[PDB]
From a paper:
We set out to design α5β1 protein binders that can bind the interface between α5 and β1 subunits, including the RGD‐binding pocket and adjacent regions, to stabilize the active conformation of α5β1. While the RGD binding site is highly conserved between RGD binding integrins, a nearby unique hydrophobic pocket formed by Trp157α5, Phe155α5, and L157β1 offers opportunities for targeting α5β1 specifically. In contrast, the corresponding residues of the close structural homolog, αvβ3 are hydrophilic (S146αv, D148αv, and R216β3). Due to their in silico origin and outstanding capacity to enhance cell adhesion, we call them NeoNectins (NN). NeoNectin stablizes the EO conformation as does FN. While FN binds to both the α5‐β1 interface and a synergy site on α5, NeoNectin only binds to the interface between α5 and β1, suggesting that the synergy site binding is not essential for the conformational switching of integrin α5β1. Various levels of success have been achieved using RGD peptides or FN fragments, but their lack of specificity for various integrins and challenges in manufacturing constrains their application.Our 65‐amino acid designed NeoNectin, which exhibits hig affinity and specificity for integrin α5β1 and can be produced with high yield, shows considerable promise in overcoming these limitations.
Integrin α5β1 is one of the principal receptors for fibronectin (FN), a major component of extracellular matrix (ECM) component that is extensively expressed in various cells and tissues. The interactions between α5β1 and FN are vital for cell attachment and migration, making them integral to various stages of development and tissue regeneration, notably in wound healing, bone regeneration, and stem cell therapy. Integrin α5β1 undergoes a large conformational change from the inactive closed state to the active open state when bound to FN. We use computational protein design to create de novo α5β1‐specific modulating miniprotein binders, called NeoNectins, that bind to and stabilize the open state of α5β1.
Residue numbers in the entry:
A (entry chain B): 63 to 75, 94 to 441
B (entry chain A): 1 to 28, 32 to 449
C (entry chain C): 1 to 65
């Protein structure tokens, strides 16, 4: 007597999906399992736009970029979340004209402008793009005094305010728009602010309230929080301030600097490139195994990289269009029961799964 | 290594008043001055005007009475006190952070108010020029010196000057003021002797022009947001006996920053010292002293926000301090020696000061602050000894607060001052500011 | 004698470009270093009128004799 193997039903891209194994004591039976990833990646994006008075010349570019970004998110992936916020600067004396007349409209007297605000989360992350187009169109400019703008407070709050913004366990992106330079820690001493930024979420009614109480955050602080929360920043800055943000790009890992203009191809291309470079890991699990039965795994990762033992269960690099092959061997030391049994082997975090039927002679 | 850290004398002021934000010596007897930016004051209608506390030494250091530099409240406006509906203060003294920079030289005292702002008569615009009072001859008379309170109104001129942000007394008594916000935050250095201030004083008119005043000229618009004068110091770099100014520019060159040396008689730039890393505040605090004992002053530059890769490659915020030694030909452009912090987010090098010959070996020493250093982020102050080869790379002593950490940072070491024989025993002494908890401890050299 | 216009400190540069275009079309010579727009060889009355108009628009301007 000897063992045998056969596949009940098979599907083309988890290539095998239903097979029956006629095991025997001391005779391992080995079968192949081929996997190819096809599910599109899920993505989250939060668009942070400056609104100081220097954005008057560039507001149309920002709005058109927002709509084009939403269109690309719809086109490239079936799963996406999108939201946006805004900022100008801390609300304290050296940075804003504090006279009572200019609190109403820091822009010119003829124009109408909203009063300044450190940061305002206009729209938490959501899966519907129609509201994103409708709500972005209603934004209006706001005034400020000094040329640099306090964006780093906004980036800090967006990074750390997890639940309110709506971040989930998924690849994250953050597009940053600005026509001018940036403040950073140590600038607050001019306005009598000395406490360093603690990094906690101080959002009340979708607005940053402790701007007057905490100094700006240093670049190291920002880098630490961004790395902890796994956010890839893309600076959609104006052509004028390209050099300073290019120098900043070196300090912050996993980021890129685009160009803000009526034509918005550059930042869109960076978004597409960031999406294409994503990769996952495949880990194979299995249901509870009956006594007197043993299993083993082999992995054939890309570039001919191969592993066995525990490493046979895992492949730490995979992308769309890539495939891996697994060799699984099943051995039994006896025949616990004449009646067959069914066990499930599926990869972690996926719906597709394999069913194997074990028979003992 | 001999500063008697086991039980230093401790001074305390009113709670929540930032007592000890800036400290200085006084020796017309001997006494210690402490700045209290947020302390309440008795002058009418002023909320948290700020005050400067005089704590005498020799007796029990427990008096710490305030100094009545000013008594008149927010001054009213001419042509609106009468022939108009209601009053309108022409100057807003509330929240002015008076005493944020207390500097004394001989019998004269300078107490600057960076955030003082005043509504102009021509238009209702309000801008923070800042002002500094000047006591002369042991409080015999008090002169208000506000050089940035000129006829140029808006930020395009000296409107947002915030003069008195950083100040220093030279050997000859000449006053120096660092206005970071002048000319759209290009910055400005203003100076004039006490005699000129006395000659040109005229309290009737709010706008007074001091004869013989020296000031940097407005530059091209490309140099905006330089913050020149964020931190100021004085030393002899020009070869002549006249003291030469040193000014910090933490955001001058694409935020790399640099520190300049200005001729003491014309304010023409003599040297430049570029930064090392983007957004590091190269010039947060500066000092000038003869560390190697050659007889020529040597520059020191702070950089609290500088980051460096860890042994595992992780970047961390430690800060750095640079040392430039003045050879007889002239100062070299590269830093002769660099000292790096250890604590993450330590802000090492955010407050520098000479100590004089504390160890008494013919070489001057230096103390470097670290407001957020230490295990508990209370703060820490190092002491780097001098020597023939330059400043030593290993701290000779480490000073930490004795009281347990509270729920808020103590900022211990955020403001230092030393090099004066306070105890009178023949060795220099140190004063350390701890304004986080409203204290200012004093150390003595055994 | 001379009029100075300061397009600095969180101000759109398109404003200064359009003012330069408008004044240049009227024949008054214009020069600019980076963003400090100035007028050369302008009469006192015309300079005062232009300064008043621009101040009404909300731009900070200065007159030099
Ligand atoms: C250390 O590093 C610092 C920072 O880089 C150096 O400081 C800067 O150096 C530059 C270059 O030397 C300076 O620009 C020059 O400034 C001088 C002096 O300008 C002042 O005096 C003038 C007297 O005639 C006056 O006209 C100026 O005012 C007008 O012009 C300014 C424009 O700056 C304008 O904003 C004002 O409103 C006025 O309209 C001003 O008060 C000046 O003579 C130079 O002019 C040159 O201009 C062109 C090129 O622009 C050139 O072709 C000409 O021939 C002429 O030479 C030039 O503007 C700058 O002022 C310095 N300071 C700052 C803060 O930037 C420092 O020099 C370095 N030191 C060392 C030792 O390396
Ligand atoms: C200087 O003196 C003024 C006036 O006495 C002090 O003003 C006080 O400031 C505090 C906090 O800014 C205020 O506290 C609040 O009081 C209300 C009710 O009194 C309380 O419900 C709140 O929870 C809060 O504690 C206080 O009202 C205000 N006025 C007075 C009369 O105390 C100022 O604090 C003093 N500054 C310093 C540094 O001591
Ligand atoms: C923005 O500019 C780029 C380059 O000038 C344009 O890129 C071209 O796009 C067309 C289709 O839109 C392609 O057929 C060309 O091959 C592209 N050429 C290059 C060099 O990129 C881009 O089209 C512009 N954006 C828009 C909206 O027209
Ligand atoms: C210089 O002025 C100070 C401040 O007035 C004098 O020191 C003490 O000041 C308090 C008031 O704050 C007085 O009550 C004391 O009597 C003063 N001390 C003495 C010894 O009188 C100081 O005395 C003045 N300088 C001199 C040389 O007298
Ligand atoms: C610093 O400025 C002083 C003057 O403000 C220079 O000293 C002399 O100044 C007079 C005029 O006041 C000139 O006639 C002399 O030629 C100057 N001395 C020399 C040696 O040139 C001084 O030179 C300046 N510093 C430097 C380094 O030149
Ligand atoms: C202004 O900053 C620039 C950029 O840092 C300096 O240019 C060079 O910067 C690199 C840093 O990667 C240095 O290694 C070079 O030595 C710099 N060039 C020179 C000639 O030193 C530039 O030097 C700075 N200028 C000033 C006046 O600070
Ligand atoms: C990995 O396995 C594949 C498939 O059998 C084989 O072709 C390749 O040579 C192996 N490479 C290594 C390094 O084992
Ligand atoms: C990971 O897989 C991708 C695609 O299969 C390949 O291009 C890349 O070289 C692999 N290795 C790394 C380190 O990304
Ligand atoms: Ca000199
Ligand atoms: Ca020396
Ligand atoms: Ca020594
Ligand atoms: Ca002593
Ligand atoms: Mn702006
Ligand atoms: Mn713009
Ligand atoms: Mn601003």
């Amino acid at each position: 007597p000897r063992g045998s193997k056969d596949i009940k039903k098979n599907k083309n891209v988890i290539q095998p999906q239903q097979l029956v194994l006629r095991l025997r004591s001391g005779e391992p039976q080995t079968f192949t399992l081929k996997f190819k990833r096809a599910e599109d990646y899920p993505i989250d994006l939060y668009y942070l736009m400056d609104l100081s008075y220097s954005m008057k010349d560039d507001l149309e570019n920002v709005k058109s970029l927002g709509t084009d970004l939403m269109n690309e998110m719809r086109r490239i992936t079936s799963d996406f979340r999108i939201g946006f916020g805004s900022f100008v600067e801390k609300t304290v004396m050296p940075y804003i004209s504090t006279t009572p007349a200019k609190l109403r409209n820091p822009c010119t007297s003829e124009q109408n402008c909203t009063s300044p605000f450190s940061y305002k989360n206009v729209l938490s992350l959501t899966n519907k793009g129609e509201v994103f187009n409708e709500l972005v169109g209603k934004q209006r400019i706001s005034g400020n005094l000094d040329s640099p703008e306090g964006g780093f407070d906004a980036i800090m709050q967006v990074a750390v305010c997890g639940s309110l913004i709506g971040w989930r366990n998924v690849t994250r992106l953050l597009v940053f728009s600005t026509d001018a330079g940036f403040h950073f820690a140590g600038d607050g001493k001019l306005g009598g602010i000395v406490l360093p930024n603690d990094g906690q979420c101080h959002l009340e009614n979708n607005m940053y309230t402790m701007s007057h109480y905490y100094d700006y955050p240093s670049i190291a602080h920002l880098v630490q929080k961004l790395s902890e929360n796994n956010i890839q920043t893309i600076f959609a800055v104006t052509e004028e301030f390209q050099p300073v943000y290019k120098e900043l790009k070196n300090l912050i890992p996993k980021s890129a600097v685009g160009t803000l203009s009526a034509n918005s191809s550059n930042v869109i291309q960076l978004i597409i490139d960031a999406y294409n470079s994503l990769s996952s890991e495949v880990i194979l699990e299995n249901g509870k195994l009956s006594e007197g039965v043993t299993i083993s795994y082999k992995s054939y990762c890309k570039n001919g990289v191969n592993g066995t033992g525990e490493n046979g269960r895992k492949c730490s690099n995979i992308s769309i269009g890539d495939e891996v092959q697994f060799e699984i061997s099943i051995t039994s030391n006896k025949c616990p029961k004449k009646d067959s049994d069914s066990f499930k082997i599926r990869p972690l975090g996926f719906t597709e799964e394999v069913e194997v039927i074990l028979q003992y002679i | 290594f001999n500063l008697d850290a086991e039980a230093p004398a401790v001074l305390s002021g009113p709670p929540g008043s930032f007592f000890g934000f800036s400290v200085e010596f006084y020796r017309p007897g001997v006494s210690v001055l402490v700045g209290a930016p947020k302390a309440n004051t008795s002058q009418p209608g002023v909320l948290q005007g700020g005050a400067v506390y005089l704590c005498p030494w020799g007796a029990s250091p427990t008096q710490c009475t305030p100094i009545e530099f000013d008594s008149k409240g927010s001054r009213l406006l001419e042509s609106s006190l009468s022939s108009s509906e209601g009053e309108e203060p022409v100057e807003y003294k509330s929240l002015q952070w008076f005493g944020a920079t207390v500097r004394a030289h001989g019998s004269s005292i300078l107490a600057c108010a960076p955030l003082y702002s005043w509504r102009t008569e021509k238009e209702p615009l309000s801008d923070p020029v800042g002002t500094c009072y000047l006591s002369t001859d042991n409080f015999t008379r008090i002169l208000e010196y506000a050089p940035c309170r000129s006829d140029f109104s808006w930020a395009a001129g000296q409107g947002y000057c915030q003069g008195g942000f950083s100040a220093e007394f030279t050997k000859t008594g000449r006053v120096v003021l660092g206005g970071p916000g002048s000319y759209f935050w290009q910055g400005q250095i203003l100076s004039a002797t006490q005699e000129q201030i006395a000659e040109s004083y005229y309290p009737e008119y709010l706008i007074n022009l001091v004869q013989g005043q020296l000031q940097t000229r407005q530059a091209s618009s490309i140099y905006d947001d330089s913050y020149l004068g964020y931190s100021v110091a004085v030393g002899e770099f020009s070869g002549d006996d006249t003291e030469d100014f040193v000014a910090g520019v933490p955001k001058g060159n694409l935020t790399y920053g640099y520190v300049t040396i200005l001729n003491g008689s014309d304010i023409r730039s003599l040297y430049n010292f570029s930064g090392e890393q983007m957004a590091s505040y190269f010039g947060y605090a500066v000092a000038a002293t003869d560390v190697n004992g050659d007889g020529l002053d040597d520059l020191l530059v702070g950089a609290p926000l500088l980051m460096d890769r860890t042994p595992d490659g992780r970047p961390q915020e430690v800060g750095r301090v640079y040392v430039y030694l003045q050879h007889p030909a002239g100062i070299e452009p590269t830093p002769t020696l660099t000292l790096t912090g250890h604590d993450e987010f330590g802000r090492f090098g955010s407050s520098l000061t000479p100590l004089g010959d504390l160890d008494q070996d013919g070489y001057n020493d230096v103390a470097i602050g670290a407001p957020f250093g230490g295990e508990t982020q209370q703060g820490v102050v190092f002491v780097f000894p001098g020597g023939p080869g330059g400043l030593g790379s290993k701290p000779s002593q480490v000073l930490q607060p004795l009281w347990a950490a509270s729920h808020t940072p103590d900022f211990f070491g955020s403001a230092l001052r030393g090099g004066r024989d306070l105890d009178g025993n023949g060795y220099p002494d140190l004063i350390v500011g701890s304004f986080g908890v409203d204290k200012a401890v004093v150390y003595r050299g055994r | 004698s001379e009029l100075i216009i300061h397009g600095r400190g969180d101000f759109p540069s398109s404003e200064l470009e359009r003012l330069r275009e408008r004044f240049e079309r009227l024949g008054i010579k214009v020069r600019v270093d980076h963003k400090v727009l100035t007028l050369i060889g302008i009469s006192e009355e015309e300079a005062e009128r232009l300064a008043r108009e621009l101040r009404k628009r909300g731009i900070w301007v200065e007159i030099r004799k």
